[PDB]
């Protein structure tokens, strides 16, 4: 779906997160909330898909004599048909669920970005590559407030207004 | 001005998986469900009861 460009080999502590760059330096930091949700979901998904397969055991093959060729062919047909059915189910579930897994992760990306955008409606400016430039100073406390979803827009609204309108 | 970015993980893993839309997709983390090797030994399960 709405995929992106770029990768973050430096962020080693989670599926998703931020790269902050302020007066106090720069750094990577993983969003523990959304990655935690994604890990919960993918774990429950893998477990459900696998648990459905778990059913009963049964010694597969049967041996029939020379006056029983036909029920013998029917038994081999049954064994082999259950083999095909289970193989096909496993194959397609693998394929489709890897597809849907990548899509789920993409959507998590989108959700995180839109959350941050709603917090920083006007006080910042969308760079385009998937970042934000602040029209004000966002120090470490400000960064953390944005990261845990408690950014204070009226706090910096006036500073951002002055700088933003100074540009134009 | 200060900048704040959003991104996601990458590593040196070469694990390739297939999807319906695309095949040999290299991913960060994967699990092989298929066991495809054996020791080649008719060994005992909990006792040398095998005859």
């Amino acid at each position: 779906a709405g995929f992106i460009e770029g990768g973050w080999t430096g962020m080693v502590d989670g599926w998703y997160g931020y790269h902050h760059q302020n007066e106090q330096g720069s750094g990577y930091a993983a969003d523990l909330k959304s990655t935690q949700n994604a890990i919960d979901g993918i774990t429950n998904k893998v477990n459900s898909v696998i648990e459905k397969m778990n059913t009963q055991f049964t010694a597969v093959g049967k041996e029939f004599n020379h006056l029983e060729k036909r029920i013998e062919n029917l038994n081999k047909k049954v064994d082999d048909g259950f083999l095909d059915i289970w193989t096909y189910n496993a194959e397609l579930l693998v394929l489709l669920e890897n597809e849907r897994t990548l899509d789920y992760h993409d959507s998590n990306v989108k959700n995180l970005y839109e959350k941050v955008r709603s917090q920083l409606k006007n006080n910042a400016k969308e760079i385009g590559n998937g970042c934000f430039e602040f029209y004000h100073k966002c120090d470490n406390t400000c960064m953390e407030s944005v990261k845990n979803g408690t950014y204070d827009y009226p706090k910096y609204s006036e500073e951002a207004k002055l700088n933003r309108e100074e540009i134009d | 001005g200060d900048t704040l970015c959003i991104g996601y993980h990458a590593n040196n893993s070469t694990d390739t998986v297939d999807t319906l839309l695309e095949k040999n997709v290299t991913v960060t983390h994967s699990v092989n469900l298929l066991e495809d090797k054996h020791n080649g030994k008719l060994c005992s399960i909990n006792g040398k009861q095998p005859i």
Partner: antibody
Amino acid sequence: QVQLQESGPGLVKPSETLSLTCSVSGASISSYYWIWIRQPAGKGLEWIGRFYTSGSPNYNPSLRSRVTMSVDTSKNQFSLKLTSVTAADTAVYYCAREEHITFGGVIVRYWGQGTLVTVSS
Amino acid sequence: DIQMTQSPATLSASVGDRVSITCRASQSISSWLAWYQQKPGKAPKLLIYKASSLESGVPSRFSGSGSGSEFTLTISSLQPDDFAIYYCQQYNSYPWTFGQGTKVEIKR
């Protein structure tokens, strides 16, 4: 193997600055978060905190005011610096490596050897 | 933030007996608990992560079961080398918290 050794003074005077240095064997410290954890004698364990070279550290609240974590990429080490030690913080220290993302969250497989820091006059 | 009740403090069981250590949490966790074994004056060694992930090289006798607020470490057959203090750690939310630990002795 990645191996973590620990160097501490053994004694710190009650109103001084504890400096501890964990040395790493064969890993690029710049690419891992590094954790400090501690145990008062035979009592329970306490997560001190986490630091990373191109990231943002995070420390335990009760020690936050006093802890600074740094990293020497030149010497391949990372150091704790605790201000205003108290003799109650008199314990074994351990340094651990925070491994990368796995399916079961983040793991600390590697562990230091533990050094006693006792705070006495 | 997150308070850890690891019962019971002291145990002593004969070889081969099953052993269960309970690690209740102040707040529920989506099975992000881990179990470590600390030998006498030695580096604590992790046993199981994700409350269900037996770390590589750990004997299969160890099984971790739990999600939400209740988790249990279960040693299927207690062996001599399994005498130590066992701690349960939580990496759901900082600050990372441990239990007071459970000392597992051996009846001989």
